[PDB]
Amino acid sequence: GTRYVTHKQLDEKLKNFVTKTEFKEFQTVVMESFAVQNQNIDAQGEQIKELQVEQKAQGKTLQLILEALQGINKRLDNLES
Amino acid sequence: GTRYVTHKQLDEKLKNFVTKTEFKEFQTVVMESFAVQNQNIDAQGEQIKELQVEQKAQGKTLQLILEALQGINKRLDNLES
Amino acid sequence: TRYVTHKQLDEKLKNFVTKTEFKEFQTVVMESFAVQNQNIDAQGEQIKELQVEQKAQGKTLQLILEALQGINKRLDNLES
């Protein structure tokens, strides 16, 4: 086994290398991990979009209120001294 | 013996394979990175929840204002006959 | 035999992951984390935007509440 590699020497060498079995096993764990986190990230993006629309709606309502207050103040001043 | 692998050819061939050490290091950094992301994603989830509560709270305030404005307008209608 | 043939070696290494396969996956994982960071940063910005808008509107709402107080007083004067 001095010039060429023997089966015992190869097996011994291969003890320190990664098998396809181990590699693929880990790949599935990683892919499923990204899947669950990304699903959470997407769900939160959805909640944000929902908040954004309501925030604009509220800003619209507020603007209306500010106008109404101006009208109320004009009517009050109209009856004032 | 020309059909056999020499020690040098084995070493060269193994240059293109992964050691358990390299793989374990990668696994750890990856799983550990997912942990960090979990912290980040959950933190934003909590920030979103707080935005939701505040938006709902302010929405209620807006409705109270809307109710107030109508009562005012009626008191003004009565004053203006 | 007891010596490894070129073919036997090839056959055996087929059950081990190649450096190229591994490197490809590693790059894919790291770039995927990069994308998550991209989206997390973007959503963080949207969150900050909403936080800023809410604080602002919160201020205005309180002012409005006060304004209604002064309006009710003016009305009471005109009626009560």
PDB file of C-alpha atoms in Angstrom:
ATOM      1  CA  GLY A   1       0.000   0.000   0.000  1.00  0.00           C
ATOM      2  CA  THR A   2       3.059   2.213  -0.186  1.00  0.00           C
ATOM      3  CA  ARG A   3       2.851   3.218  -3.861  1.00  0.00           C
ATOM      4  CA  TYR A   4      -0.898   2.963  -4.264  1.00  0.00           C
ATOM      5  CA  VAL A   5      -3.731   3.739  -1.872  1.00  0.00           C
ATOM      6  CA  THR A   6      -5.296   0.746  -0.149  1.00  0.00           C
ATOM      7  CA  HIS A   7      -8.993   0.435   0.651  1.00  0.00           C
ATOM      8  CA  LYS A   8      -8.204   0.673   4.361  1.00  0.00           C
ATOM      9  CA  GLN A   9      -6.269   3.905   3.899  1.00  0.00           C
ATOM     10  CA  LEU A  10      -9.069   5.408   1.806  1.00  0.00           C
ATOM     11  CA  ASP A  11     -11.780   4.478   4.310  1.00  0.00           C
ATOM     12  CA  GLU A  12      -9.647   6.018   7.044  1.00  0.00           C
ATOM     13  CA  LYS A  13      -9.232   9.168   4.950  1.00  0.00           C
ATOM     14  CA  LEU A  14     -12.943   9.386   4.132  1.00  0.00           C
ATOM     15  CA  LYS A  15     -13.829   9.409   7.815  1.00  0.00           C
ATOM     16  CA  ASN A  16     -13.105  13.138   7.765  1.00  0.00           C
ATOM     17  CA  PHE A  17     -15.286  14.024   4.754  1.00  0.00           C
ATOM     18  CA  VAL A  18     -18.971  14.912   4.405  1.00  0.00           C
ATOM     19  CA  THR A  19     -21.454  12.455   2.902  1.00  0.00           C
ATOM     20  CA  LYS A  20     -24.180  13.454   0.441  1.00  0.00           C
ATOM     21  CA  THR A  21     -26.600  12.095   3.056  1.00  0.00           C
ATOM     22  CA  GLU A  22     -25.445  14.556   5.721  1.00  0.00           C
ATOM     23  CA  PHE A  23     -25.237  17.420   3.224  1.00  0.00           C
ATOM     24  CA  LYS A  24     -28.728  16.954   1.774  1.00  0.00           C
ATOM     25  CA  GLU A  25     -30.198  16.402   5.228  1.00  0.00           C
ATOM     26  CA  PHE A  26     -28.882  19.825   6.238  1.00  0.00           C
ATOM     27  CA  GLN A  27     -30.074  21.412   2.977  1.00  0.00           C
ATOM     28  CA  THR A  28     -33.686  20.522   3.763  1.00  0.00           C
ATOM     29  CA  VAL A  29     -33.392  21.972   7.280  1.00  0.00           C
ATOM     30  CA  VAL A  30     -32.024  25.219   5.837  1.00  0.00           C
ATOM     31  CA  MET A  31     -34.614  25.468   3.057  1.00  0.00           C
ATOM     32  CA  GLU A  32     -37.459  24.808   5.473  1.00  0.00           C
ATOM     33  CA  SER A  33     -35.946  27.381   7.833  1.00  0.00           C
ATOM     34  CA  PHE A  34     -35.883  30.069   5.159  1.00  0.00           C
ATOM     35  CA  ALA A  35     -39.428  29.061   4.208  1.00  0.00           C
ATOM     36  CA  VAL A  36     -40.845  29.605   7.692  1.00  0.00           C
ATOM     37  CA  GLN A  37     -38.974  32.855   8.357  1.00  0.00           C
ATOM     38  CA  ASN A  38     -39.784  34.260   4.905  1.00  0.00           C
ATOM     39  CA  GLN A  39     -43.413  33.357   5.443  1.00  0.00           C
ATOM     40  CA  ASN A  40     -43.279  35.368   8.668  1.00  0.00           C
ATOM     41  CA  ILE A  41     -41.526  38.230   6.915  1.00  0.00           C
ATOM     42  CA  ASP A  42     -44.167  38.234   4.164  1.00  0.00           C
ATOM     43  CA  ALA A  43     -47.006  38.127   6.696  1.00  0.00           C
ATOM     44  CA  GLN A  44     -45.535  41.166   8.451  1.00  0.00           C
ATOM     45  CA  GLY A  45     -45.142  42.987   5.143  1.00  0.00           C
ATOM     46  CA  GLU A  46     -48.847  42.359   4.607  1.00  0.00           C
ATOM     47  CA  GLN A  47     -49.696  43.788   8.040  1.00  0.00           C
ATOM     48  CA  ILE A  48     -47.600  46.848   7.261  1.00  0.00           C
ATOM     49  CA  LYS A  49     -49.394  47.405   3.956  1.00  0.00           C
ATOM     50  CA  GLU A  50     -52.687  47.126   5.837  1.00  0.00           C
ATOM     51  CA  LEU A  51     -51.484  49.672   8.408  1.00  0.00           C
ATOM     52  CA  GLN A  52     -50.277  51.996   5.662  1.00  0.00           C
ATOM     53  CA  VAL A  53     -53.694  52.088   3.979  1.00  0.00           C
ATOM     54  CA  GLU A  54     -55.530  52.761   7.218  1.00  0.00           C
ATOM     55  CA  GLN A  55     -52.973  55.435   8.155  1.00  0.00           C
ATOM     56  CA  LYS A  56     -53.736  57.225   4.897  1.00  0.00           C
ATOM     57  CA  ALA A  57     -57.481  56.823   5.455  1.00  0.00           C
ATOM     58  CA  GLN A  58     -57.100  58.330   8.936  1.00  0.00           C
ATOM     59  CA  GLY A  59     -54.998  61.157   7.540  1.00  0.00           C
ATOM     60  CA  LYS A  60     -57.820  61.835   5.091  1.00  0.00           C
ATOM     61  CA  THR A  61     -60.389  61.819   7.891  1.00  0.00           C
ATOM     62  CA  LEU A  62     -58.226  64.192   9.946  1.00  0.00           C
ATOM     63  CA  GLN A  63     -57.929  66.613   7.023  1.00  0.00           C
ATOM     64  CA  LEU A  64     -61.723  66.609   6.770  1.00  0.00           C
ATOM     65  CA  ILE A  65     -61.998  67.292  10.494  1.00  0.00           C
ATOM     66  CA  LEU A  66     -59.565  70.202  10.226  1.00  0.00           C
ATOM     67  CA  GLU A  67     -61.726  71.712   7.494  1.00  0.00           C
ATOM     68  CA  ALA A  68     -64.919  71.172   9.512  1.00  0.00           C
ATOM     69  CA  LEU A  69     -63.318  72.949  12.476  1.00  0.00           C
ATOM     70  CA  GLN A  70     -62.580  75.908  10.227  1.00  0.00           C
ATOM     71  CA  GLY A  71     -66.214  75.988   9.158  1.00  0.00           C
ATOM     72  CA  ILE A  72     -67.440  75.716  12.731  1.00  0.00           C
ATOM     73  CA  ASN A  73     -65.163  78.583  13.773  1.00  0.00           C
ATOM     74  CA  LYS A  74     -66.487  80.753  10.952  1.00  0.00           C
ATOM     75  CA  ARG A  75     -70.074  80.079  12.024  1.00  0.00           C
ATOM     76  CA  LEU A  76     -69.200  80.837  15.640  1.00  0.00           C
ATOM     77  CA  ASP A  77     -67.502  84.106  14.676  1.00  0.00           C
ATOM     78  CA  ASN A  78     -70.536  84.957  12.535  1.00  0.00           C
ATOM     79  CA  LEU A  79     -72.720  85.022  15.640  1.00  0.00           C
ATOM     80  CA  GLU A  80     -70.044  86.674  17.770  1.00  0.00           C
ATOM     81  CA  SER A  81     -70.150  90.344  18.792  1.00  0.00           C
TER      82      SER A  81
ATOM     83  CA  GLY B   1      -0.813  -1.053 -11.268  1.00  0.00           C
ATOM     84  CA  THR B   2      -1.725   1.655 -13.768  1.00  0.00           C
ATOM     85  CA  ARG B   3      -5.359   1.087 -12.817  1.00  0.00           C
ATOM     86  CA  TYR B   4      -4.570   2.149  -9.243  1.00  0.00           C
ATOM     87  CA  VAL B   5      -4.762   5.468  -7.411  1.00  0.00           C
ATOM     88  CA  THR B   6      -1.512   6.850  -5.989  1.00  0.00           C
ATOM     89  CA  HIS B   7      -1.369   8.726  -2.673  1.00  0.00           C
ATOM     90  CA  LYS B   8      -0.796  11.957  -4.599  1.00  0.00           C
ATOM     91  CA  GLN B   9      -3.794  11.369  -6.881  1.00  0.00           C
ATOM     92  CA  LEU B  10      -6.005  10.677  -3.849  1.00  0.00           C
ATOM     93  CA  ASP B  11      -4.918  13.933  -2.194  1.00  0.00           C
ATOM     94  CA  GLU B  12      -5.579  15.853  -5.413  1.00  0.00           C
ATOM     95  CA  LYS B  13      -9.036  14.323  -5.859  1.00  0.00           C
ATOM     96  CA  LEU B  14      -9.971  15.108  -2.255  1.00  0.00           C
ATOM     97  CA  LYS B  15      -9.191  18.773  -2.863  1.00  0.00           C
ATOM     98  CA  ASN B  16     -12.658  18.931  -4.392  1.00  0.00           C
ATOM     99  CA  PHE B  17     -14.555  17.457  -1.431  1.00  0.00           C
ATOM    100  CA  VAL B  18     -15.697  18.874   1.923  1.00  0.00           C
ATOM    101  CA  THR B  19     -14.194  18.069   5.321  1.00  0.00           C
ATOM    102  CA  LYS B  20     -16.482  17.512   8.297  1.00  0.00           C
ATOM    103  CA  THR B  21     -14.826  20.523   9.948  1.00  0.00           C
ATOM    104  CA  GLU B  22     -15.654  22.906   7.105  1.00  0.00           C
ATOM    105  CA  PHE B  23     -19.198  21.578   6.955  1.00  0.00           C
ATOM    106  CA  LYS B  24     -19.785  21.781  10.729  1.00  0.00           C
ATOM    107  CA  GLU B  25     -18.469  25.354  10.737  1.00  0.00           C
ATOM    108  CA  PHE B  26     -20.918  26.247   7.961  1.00  0.00           C
ATOM    109  CA  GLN B  27     -23.816  24.509   9.732  1.00  0.00           C
ATOM    110  CA  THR B  28     -23.160  26.407  12.961  1.00  0.00           C
ATOM    111  CA  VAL B  29     -22.883  29.830  11.314  1.00  0.00           C
ATOM    112  CA  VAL B  30     -26.069  29.150   9.361  1.00  0.00           C
ATOM    113  CA  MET B  31     -28.166  27.913  12.301  1.00  0.00           C
ATOM    114  CA  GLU B  32     -26.746  30.660  14.450  1.00  0.00           C
ATOM    115  CA  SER B  33     -27.612  33.215  11.755  1.00  0.00           C
ATOM    116  CA  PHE B  34     -31.199  31.943  11.667  1.00  0.00           C
ATOM    117  CA  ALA B  35     -31.333  32.535  15.428  1.00  0.00           C
ATOM    118  CA  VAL B  36     -30.285  36.144  14.912  1.00  0.00           C
ATOM    119  CA  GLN B  37     -32.927  36.561  12.189  1.00  0.00           C
ATOM    120  CA  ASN B  38     -35.587  35.121  14.504  1.00  0.00           C
ATOM    121  CA  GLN B  39     -34.720  37.881  16.963  1.00  0.00           C
ATOM    122  CA  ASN B  40     -34.943  40.538  14.247  1.00  0.00           C
ATOM    123  CA  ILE B  41     -38.176  39.258  12.711  1.00  0.00           C
ATOM    124  CA  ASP B  42     -39.887  38.891  16.080  1.00  0.00           C
ATOM    125  CA  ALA B  43     -38.778  42.375  17.110  1.00  0.00           C
ATOM    126  CA  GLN B  44     -40.425  43.853  14.037  1.00  0.00           C
ATOM    127  CA  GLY B  45     -43.482  41.711  14.708  1.00  0.00           C
ATOM    128  CA  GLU B  46     -43.740  43.399  18.110  1.00  0.00           C
ATOM    129  CA  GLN B  47     -43.251  46.839  16.547  1.00  0.00           C
ATOM    130  CA  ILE B  48     -46.090  46.062  14.134  1.00  0.00           C
ATOM    131  CA  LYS B  49     -48.378  44.977  16.986  1.00  0.00           C
ATOM    132  CA  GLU B  50     -47.702  48.286  18.756  1.00  0.00           C
ATOM    133  CA  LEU B  51     -48.530  50.212  15.556  1.00  0.00           C
ATOM    134  CA  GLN B  52     -51.778  48.261  15.266  1.00  0.00           C
ATOM    135  CA  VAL B  53     -52.868  49.094  18.807  1.00  0.00           C
ATOM    136  CA  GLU B  54     -52.009  52.776  18.378  1.00  0.00           C
ATOM    137  CA  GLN B  55     -53.745  52.999  14.991  1.00  0.00           C
ATOM    138  CA  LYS B  56     -56.882  51.429  16.446  1.00  0.00           C
ATOM    139  CA  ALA B  57     -56.694  53.733  19.484  1.00  0.00           C
ATOM    140  CA  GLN B  58     -56.393  56.825  17.292  1.00  0.00           C
ATOM    141  CA  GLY B  59     -59.130  55.545  15.005  1.00  0.00           C
ATOM    142  CA  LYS B  60     -61.417  55.474  18.034  1.00  0.00           C
ATOM    143  CA  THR B  61     -60.362  59.020  18.927  1.00  0.00           C
ATOM    144  CA  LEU B  62     -61.157  60.128  15.385  1.00  0.00           C
ATOM    145  CA  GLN B  63     -64.620  58.583  15.622  1.00  0.00           C
ATOM    146  CA  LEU B  64     -65.226  60.384  18.925  1.00  0.00           C
ATOM    147  CA  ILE B  65     -64.249  63.625  17.202  1.00  0.00           C
ATOM    148  CA  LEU B  66     -66.563  62.856  14.286  1.00  0.00           C
ATOM    149  CA  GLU B  67     -69.349  62.348  16.829  1.00  0.00           C
ATOM    150  CA  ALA B  68     -68.464  65.596  18.582  1.00  0.00           C
ATOM    151  CA  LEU B  69     -68.499  67.573  15.329  1.00  0.00           C
ATOM    152  CA  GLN B  70     -72.035  66.413  14.544  1.00  0.00           C
ATOM    153  CA  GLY B  71     -73.306  67.492  17.948  1.00  0.00           C
ATOM    154  CA  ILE B  72     -71.656  70.867  17.424  1.00  0.00           C
ATOM    155  CA  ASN B  73     -73.129  71.328  13.942  1.00  0.00           C
ATOM    156  CA  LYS B  74     -76.567  70.609  15.364  1.00  0.00           C
ATOM    157  CA  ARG B  75     -76.102  73.164  18.145  1.00  0.00           C
ATOM    158  CA  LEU B  76     -75.124  75.646  15.434  1.00  0.00           C
ATOM    159  CA  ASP B  77     -78.140  74.775  13.276  1.00  0.00           C
ATOM    160  CA  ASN B  78     -80.379  75.439  16.272  1.00  0.00           C
ATOM    161  CA  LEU B  79     -78.632  78.770  16.893  1.00  0.00           C
ATOM    162  CA  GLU B  80     -78.998  79.771  13.245  1.00  0.00           C
ATOM    163  CA  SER B  81     -82.610  78.536  13.419  1.00  0.00           C
TER     164      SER B  81
ATOM    165  CA  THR C   1      -7.562  -6.344  -4.558  1.00  0.00           C
ATOM    166  CA  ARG C   2      -6.498  -4.158  -1.643  1.00  0.00           C
ATOM    167  CA  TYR C   3      -5.497  -1.203  -3.806  1.00  0.00           C
ATOM    168  CA  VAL C   4      -7.981   1.439  -4.947  1.00  0.00           C
ATOM    169  CA  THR C   5      -8.670   1.682  -8.695  1.00  0.00           C
ATOM    170  CA  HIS C   6      -9.453   5.006 -10.351  1.00  0.00           C
ATOM    171  CA  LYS C   7     -12.983   3.791 -11.024  1.00  0.00           C
ATOM    172  CA  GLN C   8     -13.595   2.476  -7.499  1.00  0.00           C
ATOM    173  CA  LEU C   9     -12.496   5.828  -6.113  1.00  0.00           C
ATOM    174  CA  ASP C  10     -14.877   7.703  -8.394  1.00  0.00           C
ATOM    175  CA  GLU C  11     -17.740   5.379  -7.430  1.00  0.00           C
ATOM    176  CA  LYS C  12     -17.060   5.800  -3.706  1.00  0.00           C
ATOM    177  CA  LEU C  13     -16.684   9.587  -3.790  1.00  0.00           C
ATOM    178  CA  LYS C  14     -20.087   9.780  -5.452  1.00  0.00           C
ATOM    179  CA  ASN C  15     -21.580   9.360  -1.978  1.00  0.00           C
ATOM    180  CA  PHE C  16     -19.684  12.419  -0.719  1.00  0.00           C
ATOM    181  CA  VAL C  17     -20.644  16.028  -1.472  1.00  0.00           C
ATOM    182  CA  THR C  18     -18.311  17.850  -3.846  1.00  0.00           C
ATOM    183  CA  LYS C  19     -16.706  21.149  -2.902  1.00  0.00           C
ATOM    184  CA  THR C  20     -18.429  22.753  -5.909  1.00  0.00           C
ATOM    185  CA  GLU C  21     -21.888  21.550  -4.813  1.00  0.00           C
ATOM    186  CA  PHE C  22     -21.201  22.717  -1.276  1.00  0.00           C
ATOM    187  CA  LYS C  23     -19.834  26.078  -2.365  1.00  0.00           C
ATOM    188  CA  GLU C  24     -22.833  26.663  -4.603  1.00  0.00           C
ATOM    189  CA  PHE C  25     -25.190  25.988  -1.708  1.00  0.00           C
ATOM    190  CA  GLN C  26     -23.180  28.157   0.673  1.00  0.00           C
ATOM    191  CA  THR C  27     -23.343  31.109  -1.728  1.00  0.00           C
ATOM    192  CA  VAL C  28     -27.078  30.548  -2.181  1.00  0.00           C
ATOM    193  CA  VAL C  29     -27.627  30.516   1.590  1.00  0.00           C
ATOM    194  CA  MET C  30     -25.609  33.684   2.151  1.00  0.00           C
ATOM    195  CA  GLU C  31     -27.355  35.511  -0.681  1.00  0.00           C
ATOM    196  CA  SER C  32     -30.723  34.369   0.700  1.00  0.00           C
ATOM    197  CA  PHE C  33     -29.838  35.843   4.086  1.00  0.00           C
ATOM    198  CA  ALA C  34     -28.865  39.003   2.192  1.00  0.00           C
ATOM    199  CA  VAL C  35     -32.349  39.145   0.675  1.00  0.00           C
ATOM    200  CA  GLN C  36     -33.976  38.633   4.073  1.00  0.00           C
ATOM    201  CA  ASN C  37     -31.927  41.543   5.379  1.00  0.00           C
ATOM    202  CA  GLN C  38     -33.063  43.550   2.372  1.00  0.00           C
ATOM    203  CA  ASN C  39     -36.736  42.949   3.179  1.00  0.00           C
ATOM    204  CA  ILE C  40     -36.238  43.339   6.933  1.00  0.00           C
ATOM    205  CA  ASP C  41     -34.495  46.683   6.407  1.00  0.00           C
ATOM    206  CA  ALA C  42     -37.236  47.865   4.028  1.00  0.00           C
ATOM    207  CA  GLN C  43     -40.015  46.844   6.416  1.00  0.00           C
ATOM    208  CA  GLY C  44     -38.078  48.465   9.243  1.00  0.00           C
ATOM    209  CA  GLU C  45     -38.167  51.712   7.280  1.00  0.00           C
ATOM    210  CA  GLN C  46     -41.906  51.437   6.666  1.00  0.00           C
ATOM    211  CA  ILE C  47     -42.353  50.795  10.389  1.00  0.00           C
ATOM    212  CA  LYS C  48     -40.357  53.907  11.279  1.00  0.00           C
ATOM    213  CA  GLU C  49     -42.468  55.872   8.785  1.00  0.00           C
ATOM    214  CA  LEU C  50     -45.685  54.717  10.481  1.00  0.00           C
ATOM    215  CA  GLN C  51     -44.242  55.413  13.939  1.00  0.00           C
ATOM    216  CA  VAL C  52     -43.423  58.956  12.809  1.00  0.00           C
ATOM    217  CA  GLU C  53     -46.851  59.475  11.234  1.00  0.00           C
ATOM    218  CA  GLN C  54     -48.615  58.140  14.315  1.00  0.00           C
ATOM    219  CA  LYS C  55     -46.728  60.376  16.735  1.00  0.00           C
ATOM    220  CA  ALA C  56     -47.537  63.336  14.491  1.00  0.00           C
ATOM    221  CA  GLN C  57     -51.244  62.501  14.213  1.00  0.00           C
ATOM    222  CA  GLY C  58     -51.328  61.810  17.931  1.00  0.00           C
ATOM    223  CA  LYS C  59     -50.212  65.386  18.553  1.00  0.00           C
ATOM    224  CA  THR C  60     -52.841  66.817  16.210  1.00  0.00           C
ATOM    225  CA  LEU C  61     -55.609  64.719  17.762  1.00  0.00           C
ATOM    226  CA  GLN C  62     -54.878  66.070  21.225  1.00  0.00           C
ATOM    227  CA  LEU C  63     -54.942  69.602  19.820  1.00  0.00           C
ATOM    228  CA  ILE C  64     -58.293  68.892  18.177  1.00  0.00           C
ATOM    229  CA  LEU C  65     -59.729  67.570  21.436  1.00  0.00           C
ATOM    230  CA  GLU C  66     -58.680  70.836  23.076  1.00  0.00           C
ATOM    231  CA  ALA C  67     -60.186  72.837  20.197  1.00  0.00           C
ATOM    232  CA  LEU C  68     -63.534  71.086  20.710  1.00  0.00           C
ATOM    233  CA  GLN C  69     -63.323  72.168  24.347  1.00  0.00           C
ATOM    234  CA  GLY C  70     -63.093  75.809  23.318  1.00  0.00           C
ATOM    235  CA  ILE C  71     -65.896  75.319  20.813  1.00  0.00           C
ATOM    236  CA  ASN C  72     -68.237  73.877  23.432  1.00  0.00           C
ATOM    237  CA  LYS C  73     -67.484  76.885  25.630  1.00  0.00           C
ATOM    238  CA  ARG C  74     -68.328  79.321  22.832  1.00  0.00           C
ATOM    239  CA  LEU C  75     -71.552  77.429  22.150  1.00  0.00           C
ATOM    240  CA  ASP C  76     -72.553  77.445  25.818  1.00  0.00           C
ATOM    241  CA  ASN C  77     -71.997  81.201  25.824  1.00  0.00           C
ATOM    242  CA  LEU C  78     -74.285  81.596  22.816  1.00  0.00           C
ATOM    243  CA  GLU C  79     -76.927  79.329  24.351  1.00  0.00           C
ATOM    244  CA  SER C  80     -76.270  78.886  28.081  1.00  0.00           C
TER     245      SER C  80
END
